[PDB]
Symmetry: C4
Subunit: 82 residues, 4 copies
């Protein structure tokens, strides 16, 4: 896959995760964007996490759709800076 | 391995992790399924974690059997959506 | 590397991590073994973590020496069960 | 990439993460170095995490720039010890 296409795919994941956490769990836009990155990178501090059943389901969907996309994106970014 | 076989293997892991956390640590089915995904993806928020020796042993078995299976499953899912 | 050699290497890592956490941070043998797996798998719940400077230094050494070894071990285990 | 170049790149990441957490979030140099490793390895205990918007933005930049670099560094270290 072209690197720019991978960029678009990870940006779509980031939008999905951020809007979902914001509307389902009620955290600010900024906190939700931070949480999205922390989640799809698999860092998972746990300072923020879903407290509702819908949020838990949503978080599973983000894990399944986002961790692989983020991993490929990081690997492509490696090529362009190294 | 055929992608559908990998799907069955990760589903077996998810059933194992969910039933085990539910019966050993006493969390709800929904929380246990969420915790299973959070664990085998290596996100590990820590909002849920085993509190008993048996739960800690069980969690190690899920880590050993589940992280690799989940990683292959995510990589295969990448092929079918990208 | 032969799979059995990888097994010995990850077992050495597990012994190192477990004894170190036990003696430096003072947690039980069982908790320390659980924490070692949670750490080198990069799950990182945070229910246990080093509280002392020596423990933090030790944990960095385990992260550097252990995450790669564990990742290769999981990948080899995948070959023998799938 | 030559392994020694990868070493320099991960050291640059470690300096960036450590100084940034120290000055933005106000934690000690030692805690900030520990947190940097815990973050770029994706362990993410959560015993330390950014509490400010600037810290959250900075942490995202470290995640994006650091996880891939650390992963390659660990893989190279594997070659030299195994
Ligand atoms: K992780
Ligand atoms: K983690
Ligand atoms: K974590
Ligand atoms: K990999
Ligand atoms: K955590």
């Amino acid at each position: 896959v072209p690197a720019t296409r991978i960029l678009l795919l990870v940006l779509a994941v980031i939008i999905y995760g951020t809007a979902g956490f914001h509307f389902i769990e009620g955290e600010s836009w900024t906190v939700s964007l931070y949480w999205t990155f922390v989640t799809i990178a698999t860092v998972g501090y746990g300072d923020y996490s879903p407290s509702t059943p819908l949020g838990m389901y949503f978080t599973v969907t983000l894990i399944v759709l986002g961790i692989g996309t983020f991993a490929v994106a990081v690997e492509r970014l490696l090529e362009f800076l190294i």
